[PDB]
Amino acid sequence: KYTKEDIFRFADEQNVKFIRLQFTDILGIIKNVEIPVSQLKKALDNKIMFDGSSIEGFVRIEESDMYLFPDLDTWVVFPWTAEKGKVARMICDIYNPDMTPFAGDPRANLKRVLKEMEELGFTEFNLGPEPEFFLFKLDENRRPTLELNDSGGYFDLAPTDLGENCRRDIVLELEEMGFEIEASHHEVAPGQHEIDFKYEDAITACDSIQTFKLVVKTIARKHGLHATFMPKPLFGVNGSGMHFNMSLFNEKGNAFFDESGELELSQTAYHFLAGMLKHARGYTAVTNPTINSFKRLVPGYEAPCYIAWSGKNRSPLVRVPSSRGLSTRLELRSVDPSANPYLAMAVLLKAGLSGIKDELTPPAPVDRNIYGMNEEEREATGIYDLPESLGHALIELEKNEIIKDGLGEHIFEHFIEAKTIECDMFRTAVHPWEREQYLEIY
Amino acid sequence: KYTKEDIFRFADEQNVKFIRLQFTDILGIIKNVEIPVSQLKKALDNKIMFDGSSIEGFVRIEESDMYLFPDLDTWVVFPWTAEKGKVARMICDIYNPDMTPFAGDPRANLKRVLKEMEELGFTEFNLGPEPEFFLFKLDENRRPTLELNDSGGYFDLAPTDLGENCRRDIVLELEEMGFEIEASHHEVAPGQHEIDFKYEDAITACDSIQTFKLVVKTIARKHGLHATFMPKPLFGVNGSGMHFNMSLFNEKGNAFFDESGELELSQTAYHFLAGMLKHARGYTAVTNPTINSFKRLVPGYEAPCYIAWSGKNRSPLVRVPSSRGLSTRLELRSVDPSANPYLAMAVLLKAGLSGIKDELTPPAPVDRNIYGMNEEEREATGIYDLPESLGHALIELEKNEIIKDGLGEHIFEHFIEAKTIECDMFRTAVHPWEREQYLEIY
Amino acid sequence: KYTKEDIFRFADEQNVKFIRLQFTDILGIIKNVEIPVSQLKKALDNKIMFDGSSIEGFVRIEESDMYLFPDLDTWVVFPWTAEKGKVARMICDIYNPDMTPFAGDPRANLKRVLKEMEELGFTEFNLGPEPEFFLFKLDENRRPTLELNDSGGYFDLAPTDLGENCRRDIVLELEEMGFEIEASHHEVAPGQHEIDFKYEDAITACDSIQTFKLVVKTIARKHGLHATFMPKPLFGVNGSGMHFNMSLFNEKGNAFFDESGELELSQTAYHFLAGMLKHARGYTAVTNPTINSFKRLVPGYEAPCYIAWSGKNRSPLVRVPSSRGLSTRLELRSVDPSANPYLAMAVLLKAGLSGIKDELTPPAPVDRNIYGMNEEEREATGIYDLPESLGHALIELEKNEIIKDGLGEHIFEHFIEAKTIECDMFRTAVHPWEREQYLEIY
Ligand SMILES: Nc1ncnc2c1ncn2[C@@H]1O[C@H](COP(=O)(O)OP(=O)(O)O)[C@@H](O)[C@H]1O
Ligand SMILES: Nc1ncnc2c1ncn2[C@@H]1O[C@H](COP(=O)(O)OP(=O)(O)O)[C@@H](O)[C@H]1O
Ligand SMILES: Nc1ncnc2c1ncn2[C@@H]1O[C@H](COP(=O)(O)OP(=O)(O)O)[C@@H](O)[C@H]1O
Ligand SMILES: C[S@](=O)(CC[C@H](N)C(=O)O)=NP(=O)(O)O
Ligand SMILES: C[S@](=O)(CC[C@H](N)C(=O)O)=NP(=O)(O)O
Ligand SMILES: C[S@](=O)(CC[C@H](N)C(=O)O)=NP(=O)(O)O
């Protein structure tokens, strides 16, 4: 743990002229408040209020006042605000003025369900994500447009890769913030890039994910580009999906490692699988909270459409990397980077360890092309489709209780009313698709 | 009736020059062909054949060849500027290479189910439809714009209803084609138009419907405006429905008319409703065979939203016009003018005739305005909500096996497939609404 | 030879910041992935993998996860990567996750055929390339226009060769990267360029080739010019193909130099050419693997048109440069820079190592201008005619089962699929040519 006092003098060895307290709203969006180095004790002693009412996902305007308490380990300095004022960073948890924490804080609802594996013995919850992102050219307005940075491809090179000089500026801006970056490259769709790093403690891997998305964006609008974490911005091309590499640690040993099994996977991992897969239909409404996230979960674009799993195969809902070692992990790939990392982790922790506790037995590893299977030749194998509309997936989540009770009373009730009414805008609205399709033939 | 010896007489009488053989495809699309008056006798020998694989939903390409047998009762000369190109049409029944009526021919389907009221004792099946349509301007190159001629409202007056020479010229041309016209006016939303005509038996009111769209499609395009029967071409204004006013007749009798029961309504009628009411869930993919009509089917714009009935009231599924007697009608507002009036009539007959052989005890009249209740108030009565989408409205249909038997087994087999892919063709696509709300946001 | 101890040294000596792991897909398309020096150990431990399903022609999606084993004798720093993000490269080999190598990987297909020359006693199957490219200007939005920056001819000078300082800044950039470069000059057709570099043993020239292209694409786009290797980009002017200057060696002695035989040429030398002459029809699908290069193979433009050889003459399929000694070389000419430098060598090795176990008494020099002979004489001497299209070269390929074996089999069946697709995706399409010559005509 970082100290409170040596943080006060952390600003004098680097003359930090501002600190940015930052937390996260219900929809995954990073809100912020900036304060000078002048107010540093006023925040470290937890006396910084705000207006709760206007942050979508919090209390009503009657009980508006809400305080902010910093997590003194999430101290980095913003490397690009040299020369103006060296700007630090600190992540906060949201507290009601009763000094009772807020059960609607997205970072509390993981800070609590990470203690249920405490009651049953595991060291850590290791998340290494793969947040994929597209990049679009800007204009004279510097207001983004739907023309991608290159008509490139998977692993292709300059001249065909025009973010080669951009990703590289993004990775060295992230590494200056104390990361360990695995690789950098261009994904299979045009303008689609992927920067993956090394796994971390569940919450400090989640904190690190809200870091990444802010660096990828500010350092692109510095390259003439704009970075989108929208899952399916085009038709008929790979979507951007934030893979979920999960692995529990236990006393300096990967909980998933069976040293001399055939699939070298402990029967902990095997009842971990049946956890999410049983519950897959419920919780994905959370892990893909935008209507468009389903417009991406279609057959053919390396995205999963059916609830299943296999080994080193990129069709199913979960993939097992053929390399395990101490990096042994199972790859839930039905996560896209519009969900809340704090909330996808909490949900999938619960309904995931619910499979070892209940000891659920795991279904068949479907080792072929899941997209190449008849409507009725996969219906004999029991595997069935992931829900197609947000209305459908919200019904099958609200139905589910095991994940509904790790979503908090205040978050779920504040969530489905936001996802439904977001979806009614859709169902009521007519798009220019429908004009094209009908207006002249009828 | 009309003998073959009339048609020749009328040709050499009215001096027609070319003959058209119209029929209607699976989706509602009147498709015809031209022959000289030198062919007049050959078509009446019913020895004139077209490409069967080439009209949607009819047949496959290995049994392409299919015959056209005209209906001499339909003869009407086309009255536009054709002195030398004077026309004459005849709506065709479709037959096989073995002369048996074609299962797919929807003109056959209507008549087929019509013989199911010849055994419940009813002379006719009258239908007075209200096909409401929109008027759009045309560009310099005669392509449909997205502006509408005027910005008037219900019943408005010149100079704020541009289509007042338009409908004038629409109505007159119809009055030449054997029509008797009731009225011509402006509807709720701007550039919308209602033209009404006296009821007729189905296979002749619907022939007065397929004739209607054409002679508004063309006469409106003679005033330089393209006309649509798209349900809701603009979000936030009344989708144009095509109200379905019907009546069964009994030895010169309006079989819904007995001036005693609760409203001066009969029992063959009070029973009819419970058939619709019960089977209404399962016939909305036929009354509304398009993704877009489910966008008129949000409430507030005088369209049906839930499955209940009332009097004098334009909010429910079925309104009953106060005027009664011969004017005693059952008004069904769920149909919109994209639908197939040979499949729509065929189906509702087998919904409501399933309510004279059981009569199924109709539910309560909600004389409120049903748009103004709550999810706890709909459930208080227990009123069925019309389905969500072309998605549900497709599964809700392959349940009602009395309705499936109103389309036939080869018309339903070529109507689920043609909507399934058309439904899938929208489910997968990404339309601009998805990028506005998310691209610059996530 | 270089050791993994040497590369831990240079990264801290050069102070490089990223390592790029590179390979080639089936089509000659370079695909590489960038990683920090912070992961220099994981690749030298071979513990870095990728997605095989996305490398065009590597594998199919069910068994994707595949390893990356790096080659150290391939290490070079990039020189254009300032002191801010300096870059070191390493060409790799592909290993299936079970640590067995990949039969579809082209680099090891060569290694296996270069072992077929250890059974015949040959230290080196040396190769010198002549990749010829075009230069197209760049528009305002960095898009390669249809203008050639210069309108010159052979060996011309400033000011009638724009890319004079271009071919300078490439050479230096090549010269920083351990290259030995012969000659930098303007080629025949306008806006054409050649850069000759001295030979190296096959797998290291194939490295030096795919590398050399990357250095001209990226440098040419510094001066803002698209660098392309399309064989016949313009019709009616010289095609830019990649000559193949090959020579065998045994104990520091060229195996083709014996100043007794008629042309100062050896026996294995003369014998080699029969191994190509007959087999030439077969591999002309691997040396010209594109629709476009079969318009280059036409007569007139100093490119092989029929299968023939001769001395100091630049019409035939094989040229033999007058200069002999250690520069005693055989010049194959069908190849275009769109061919796979790994496939071509293992093809031509097994092709021309077939003329040393069989040797087929190679035919005699038609040292005429074979560009100027009518059909009455081409089948007089019996000179085989080259295939006329991709689709012809393919059927001509699946018969010489030794070239087929030269390719392995995975590469082969992965090859016939896509080119038959490519050949068929061009057989069926319609291009504005046929629209001029027939539309207003017929
Ligand atoms: N034991 C583990 N638990 C969780 N995540 C891991 C583990 N080992 C590796 N990872 C993560 O897997 C990710 C690999 O990224 P990438 O190479 O894009 O995956 P893929 O092989 O699916 O393409 C990294 O983010 C890394 O942190
Ligand atoms: N007895 C009847 N049976 C069936 N349809 C009828 C009957 N009387 C009138 N109609 C139809 O009602 C239509 C007129 O409807 P409209 O004036 O729009 O009434 P509303 O405004 O109540 O819908 C006419 O087209 C006519 O054919
Ligand atoms: N003995 C040899 N073995 C292999 N390659 C050779 C030999 N001699 C020359 N080369 C190659 O020939 C190339 C020079 O080609 P170039 O100068 O264009 O000759 P030409 O103009 O006759 O084609 C060099 O790239 C070199 O690698
Ligand atoms: C090549 S991809 O394999 C693409 C997967 C897809 N874009 C998605 O996850 O949505 N995934 P990864 O980065 O793990 O290799
Ligand atoms: C009030 S309206 O009823 C307009 C109908 C509405 N736009 C609909 O068809 O959904 N039609 P009409 O007055 O002729 O009965
Ligand atoms: C006689 S030329 O040979 C002209 C090149 C020709 N257009 C070709 O197809 O290679 N080239 P080079 O002198 O490099 O051998």
Author numbering:
A (entry chain O), B (entry chain H), C (entry chain A): 3 to 444
What did the article's authors report about this structure?
In Gram-positive bacteria, nitrogen homeostasis is controlled by an operon encoding glutamine synthetase (GS), a dodecameric machine that assimilates ammonium into glutamine, and the GlnR repressor. GlnR detects nitrogen excess indirectly by binding glutamine-feedback-inhibited-GS (FBI-GS), which activates its transcription-repression function. GS generates glutamine from glutamate, ATP, and ammonium by a mechanism that involves the initial phosphorylation of the γ-carboxyl group of glutamate by ATP and the subsequent incorporation of ammonium. The structures show FBI-GS binds the GlnR C-terminal domain within its active-site cavity, juxtaposing two GlnR monomers to form a DNA-binding-competent GlnR dimer.
To visualize the active, transition state (TS) conformations of the GS proteins we reacted them with l-methionine-S-sulfoximine (MSO) in the presence of ATP and solved the structures. In these structures, the Met-Sox-P methyl group occupies the ammonium substrate binding site, thus mimicking the GS transition state and preventing further reaction. Structures of the Pp, Lm, and Sa GS-Met-Sox-P-ADP complexes were obtained to 1.98, 3.50, and 2.95 Å resolution, respectively. These structures were all dodecameric and densities for Met-Sox-P and ADP were clearly observed in each enzyme. The GS TS structures all display the same contacts to the Met-Sox-P and ADP. The resultant ammonia would then be in an ideal position to attack the γ-glutamyl phosphate intermediate. Thus, the GSI-α·Met-Sox-P·ADP complexes mimic the tetrahedral adduct, formed before the generation of the glutamine and inorganic phosphate products. Strikingly, while the TS structures are similar to each other, they show significant differences, both global and local, when compared to the corresponding apo and FBI-GS-GlnR bound states (as apo and FBI-GS-GlnR conformations are the same, the state will be referred to as apo/FBI-GS-GlnR). Although all GS active site loops are altered upon TS formation, residues in the D50´ loop undergo the most dramatic structural rearrangements. In the TS state, Asp62´ and Arg316 are repositioned to provide an optimal active site architecture. Thus, our structural analyses indicate that GS enzymes from low G + C Gram-positive bacteria adopt two distinct states, the active, TS conformation (herein termed the “A” state) and the conformation adopted by apo GS/FBI-GS-GlnR, termed the “I” or inhibited state.
